[PDB]
Amino acid sequence: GSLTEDGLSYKEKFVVRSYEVGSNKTATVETIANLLQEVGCNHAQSVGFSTDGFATTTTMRKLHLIWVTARMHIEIYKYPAWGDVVEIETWCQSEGRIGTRRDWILKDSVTGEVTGRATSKWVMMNQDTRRLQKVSDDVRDEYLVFCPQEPRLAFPEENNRSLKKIPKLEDPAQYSMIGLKPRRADLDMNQHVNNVTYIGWVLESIPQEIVDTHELQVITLDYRRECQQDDVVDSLTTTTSNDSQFLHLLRLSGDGQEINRGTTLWRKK
Amino acid sequence: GSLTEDGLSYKEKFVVRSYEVGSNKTATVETIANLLQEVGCNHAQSVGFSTDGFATTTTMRKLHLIWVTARMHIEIYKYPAWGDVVEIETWCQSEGRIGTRRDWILKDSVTGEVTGRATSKWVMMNQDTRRLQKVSDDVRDEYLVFCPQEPRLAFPEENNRSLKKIPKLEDPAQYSMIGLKPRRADLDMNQHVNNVTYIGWVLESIPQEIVDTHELQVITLDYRRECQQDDVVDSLTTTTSDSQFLHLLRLSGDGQEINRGTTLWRKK
Numbered sequence A: 001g002s003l004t005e006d007g008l009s010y011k012e013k014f015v016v017r018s019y020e021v022g023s024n025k026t027a028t029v030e031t032i033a034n035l036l037q038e039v040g041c042n043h044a045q046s047v048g049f050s051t052d053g054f055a056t057t058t059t060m061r062k063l064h065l066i067w068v069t070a071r072m073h074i075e076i077y078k079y080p081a082w083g084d085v086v087e088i089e090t091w092c093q094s095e096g097r098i099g100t101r102r103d104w105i106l107k108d109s110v111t112g113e114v115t116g117r118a119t120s121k122w123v124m125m126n127q128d129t130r131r132l133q134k135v136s137d138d139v140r141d142e143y144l145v146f147c148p149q150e151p152r153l154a155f156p157e158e159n160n161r162s163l164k165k166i167p168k169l170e171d172p173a174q175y176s177m178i179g180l181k182p183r184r185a186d187l188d189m190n191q192h193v194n195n196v197t198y199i200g201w202v203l204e205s206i207p208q209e210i211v212d213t214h215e216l217q218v219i220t221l222d223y224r225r226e227c228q229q230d231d232v233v234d235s236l237t238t239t240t241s242n243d244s245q246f247l248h249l250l251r252l253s254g255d256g257q258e259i260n261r262g263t264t265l266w267r268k269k
Numbered sequence B: 001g002s003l004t005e006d007g008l009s010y011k012e013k014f015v016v017r018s019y020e021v022g023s024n025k026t027a028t029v030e031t032i033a034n035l036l037q038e039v040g041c042n043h044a045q046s047v048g049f050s051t052d053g054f055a056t057t058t059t060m061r062k063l064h065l066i067w068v069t070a071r072m073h074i075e076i077y078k079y080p081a082w083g084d085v086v087e088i089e090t091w092c093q094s095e096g097r098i099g100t101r102r103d104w105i106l107k108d109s110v111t112g113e114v115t116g117r118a119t120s121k122w123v124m125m126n127q128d129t130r131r132l133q134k135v136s137d138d139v140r141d142e143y144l145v146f147c148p149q150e151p152r153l154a155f156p157e158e159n160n161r162s163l164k165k166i167p168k169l170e171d172p173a174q175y176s177m178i179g180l181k182p183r184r185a186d187l188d189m190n191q192h193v194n195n196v197t198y199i200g201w202v203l204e205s206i207p208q209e210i211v212d213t214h215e216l217q218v219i220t221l222d223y224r225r226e227c228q229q230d231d232v233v234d235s236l237t238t239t240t241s242d243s244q245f246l247h248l249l250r251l252s253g254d255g256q257e258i259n260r261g262t263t264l265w266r267k268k
């Protein structure tokens, strides 16, 4: 991987592995999500930021401040097959008082065609209290020299799907998968549940008949609270709709505290 | 990756990814196990065998025959750090009536030092009945041209750790993790639980204090029965000692055994 010529974006190629593919012999959406985080980490490494997933500066580390994902939105047109080469380009931008954004474009290396795109919203928070706090000008200024100044959006449309408000699923859910819990492989280097694990958990409550006859086109996931290493999660889904759409909710098995909400859109094969 | 000059082995390099590392910022043993299966798959692809994990021929597919792992044994001296390049060489050999073997050697690309080694035993079985069945001469002859003729062992020594018999853990277990179940990411392209998932499940019942103060040096795992997509598993561990453990994976309900194993950990 490498920074591009203008140094305002980062590109990396990946060859799809045998264990990375699903029943369609193409990369799963969780494999794609892992690759997005990977190219994000390599971008941070390339310009001197932390590589722990929080992409911090020395100033933020003295204050115990971190960047955390508030929303992930992925749209895939073609999943790459086993052995194919996928090229991923990523960039960041500041969105002032609202927080920050990281975007991605996925392309087939052989044809140069755009096979998918993704966007994510980030907020700043004290890692100990979990209280949000607005970025100071001195912290922000250190990042702006690595971002394009003119708007560069993977999702330019004014009322596009990536910004839609997601409602809260009401009981009873149409489908459920209960008692889900993370194992050590679901944790990162600092013992936090990897953001991709929550994608896998949302999808566990999709009926297998849908997975067998449809392909996932869009997933939007809001991140409200983290699931700790010793927590247990319930995954709930209700059909909201040749296309199928679902409303999703992840909550703690016991008291029902919400950790994530989302929506998915599937197209018939 | 590529076949070597004599065409009797396969080599591939991997750069360790950010999500592949544990709390030590080095590759987890499950990441290593995934890489071993990956280089195995690329070796099969390179010479025309199936790439579904069963490494079959057209003749075996007509008979619904598959190769299945009976034992995996891995020894790691140094786990590769995030961003390091690890080179892995793999080869196969027939062991006649006992079954077959696939070996691996892991090396640090920069120094050329051996950082780990692994071996696995395989048996042939009918995919539908799960009955064992001996390899016919016509089936085995198609594989021998891709294997070294002289013995080439990652663990050459007579009666070494890789061939030791593993006993069955007796109740009560010292430690347990119950109600483990696979999610879609634990399944392969054919909807079977990936062999690496069973490694993760064995390790779930190791106390976190051991993981925090020790490094896994050796893992030997026998594979007795497949955990289906809708099965639920209990992971049991008892200290037998460096720290050593006896492990057992069994179905949550009736206690049917699916795996047994041992691990050896070195203080950091």
Ligand SMILES: COC(=O)N1CCN(c2ccc(F)cc2)CC1
Pocket: A040, A053, A054, A055, A067, A092, A093, A094, A100, A101, A102, A122, A140, A143, A144, A147
């Ligand atoms: C792993 O973290 C990220 O990918 N992000 C997204 C980009 N971020 C950012 C911060 C300040 C700014 F002015 C512009 C962008 C930081 C968090």
Ligand SMILES: COC(=O)N1CCN(c2ccc(F)cc2)CC1
Pocket: B040, B053, B054, B055, B067, B092, B093, B094, B100, B101, B102, B122, B140, B143, B144, B147
């Ligand atoms: C994924 O499967 C493997 O890795 N295997 C199984 C098949 N193997 C083999 C080796 C020599 C032989 F004569 C017949 C079969 C051993 C390696």
